[PDB]
Write a protein that binds this DNA or RNA. Structure first.
Ligand SMILES: Nc1ncnc2c1ncn2[C@@H]1O[C@@H]2COP(=O)(O)O[C@H]2[C@H]1O
Ligand SMILES: Nc1ncnc2c1ncn2[C@@H]1O[C@@H]2COP(=O)(O)O[C@H]2[C@H]1O
Ligand SMILES: Nc1ncnc2c1ncn2[C@@H]1O[C@@H]2COP(=O)(O)O[C@H]2[C@H]1O
Ligand SMILES: Nc1ncnc2c1ncn2[C@@H]1O[C@@H]2COP(=O)(O)O[C@H]2[C@H]1O
Lengths: 200, 200
DNA sequence: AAAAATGTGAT
DNA sequence: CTAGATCACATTTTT
DNA sequence: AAAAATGTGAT
DNA sequence: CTAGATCACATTTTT
């Protein structure tokens, strides 16, 4: 679409390599990111330093927006690159202007925040409402049904560690494994190493 | 401020009585609400029908916005009146126009969604990261330090059932009580009926 | 009058 | 090791 | 070479 | 009654 590239045309593009960190939690916020390609993980931590993945984001997504509507906003979470990334960046100040000349961009952003509020709210329910098994199961279905999931005679195949699965559903790595083994004993999946086949 | 009343001047005001329901979950969304006075609770439910309070909202807050950026959006949660309310209402369609003539209103809304995303994300951490006691404690401190909390020689006094406390932190009513009694045994609070005094 | 909100105490 | 959920009336509290 | 990610099995 | 967390190496897997 036009408008997207007018905005882009006003951003510095940057690349980050997998595992690097685009946004530092609690730092002062003055920039807005747009992921042109690649994948990132928004994550929060606890005192011990244990992590909690609040969400993933991909091509198309805006990052670093929450601290865009009030002076002295600090970053709410850390943003790490899931994969190699190309991210458009633009100053808050600069961006603000674009809006004035074009209120569509601001609308498009807000839609994304709107969508996010739903997922996070949904995720709040999930924890309050489902057990780890239940949560883990759901996570395997979503992943398994994504663009990156792979094809497999018996269903769809995903690749991920029991560590990162635990930081998505909010449980310990040991608990993921005990449950992954139970899900296999129930013939729902087959898991070898980081590879897991969700049957279908 | 000016702009607020220009917007208001384009809304039908309505009153709802405590316990009534302003928004029906899953219904088609076409209206946007603005709370002119009173308090509401955004809540989600599970199959059993058990509730989970995602948040409270008060004078100043917008409601019914998530389903404002895409055709055929359905309400994400139920909205019930905590207290007697006066809520400005305006069609999505109508509202959209105001924005065009004035992009400040749309900005002001987005700020609120932004703020919300933070609290909900924070709330996600809270569950993933704290135990009920920990969660309950935090809830008593927030409530206790609000405009409605009451004054008391020993600290601040709040009034609320162990039922609604459980639907905020996400635990059972029985568990709230066991913990409220433990918090008293630790001399942190004093609880008689719905009344609780958080010491200070 | 009943509903509404709580409490056991065990398990 | 041990935090929560669940149970099903009799007992308080509200509307 | 080590880090990184896992697994026990008990409790 | 019973779902999770925690523990601290020896054992796989990566970078
Ligand atoms: N709950 C969430 N869901 C999705 N993205 C989020 C969430 N919380 C934070 N983010 C993103 O992570 C960023 C962290 O810093 P910012 O507050 O600048 O902006 C935040 C968003 O871009
Ligand atoms: N309540 C929680 N308890 C334990 N780990 C958690 C929790 N919430 C999120 N996590 C994270 O999820 C991760 C799962 O694998 P780890 O045990 O390596 O580390 C865990 C933490 O980083
Ligand atoms: N997590 C949340 N935090 C705050 N308010 C919310 C949240 N989820 C939903 N709401 C409000 O509740 C409304 C439910 O219907 P809508 O999707 O129209 O718009 C939603 C918001 O106004
Ligand atoms: N995981 C959960 N288990 C039980 N109740 C929950 C949960 N998450 C939210 N809730 C709600 O919190 C309420 C606490 O009091 P109740 O037992 O009356 O009913 C409970 C549910 O409506």
């Amino acid at each position: 679409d036009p408008t997207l590239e007018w905005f882009l045309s006003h951003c510095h593009i940057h690349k980050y390599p997998s595992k690097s960190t685009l946004i530092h939690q609690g730092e002062k916020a003055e920039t807005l990111y747009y992921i042109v390609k690649g994948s990132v993980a928004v994550l929060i931590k606890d005192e011990e330093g244990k992590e909690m993945i609040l969400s993933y984001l991909n091509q198309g997504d805006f990052i670093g927006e929450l601290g865009l509507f009030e002076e002295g906003q600090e970053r709410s979470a850390w943003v790490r690159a899931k994969t190699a990334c190309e991210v458009a960046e633009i100053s808050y100040k600069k961006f603000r202007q674009l809006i004035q000349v074009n209120p569509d961009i601001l609308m498009r952003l807000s839609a994304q925040m709107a969508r996010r509020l739903q997922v996070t709210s949904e995720k709040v329910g999930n924890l309050a409402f489902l057990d780890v098994t239940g949560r883990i199961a759901q996570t395997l279905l979503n992943l398994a049904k994504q663009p990156d999931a792979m094809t497999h005679p018996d269903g769809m195949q995903i690749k991920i560690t029991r560590q990162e699965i635990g930081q998505i559903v909010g449980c310990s790595r040991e608990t993921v494994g005990r449950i992954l083994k139970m899900l296999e004993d129930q013939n729902l999946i087959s898991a070898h190493g980081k590879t897991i086949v969700v049957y279908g």
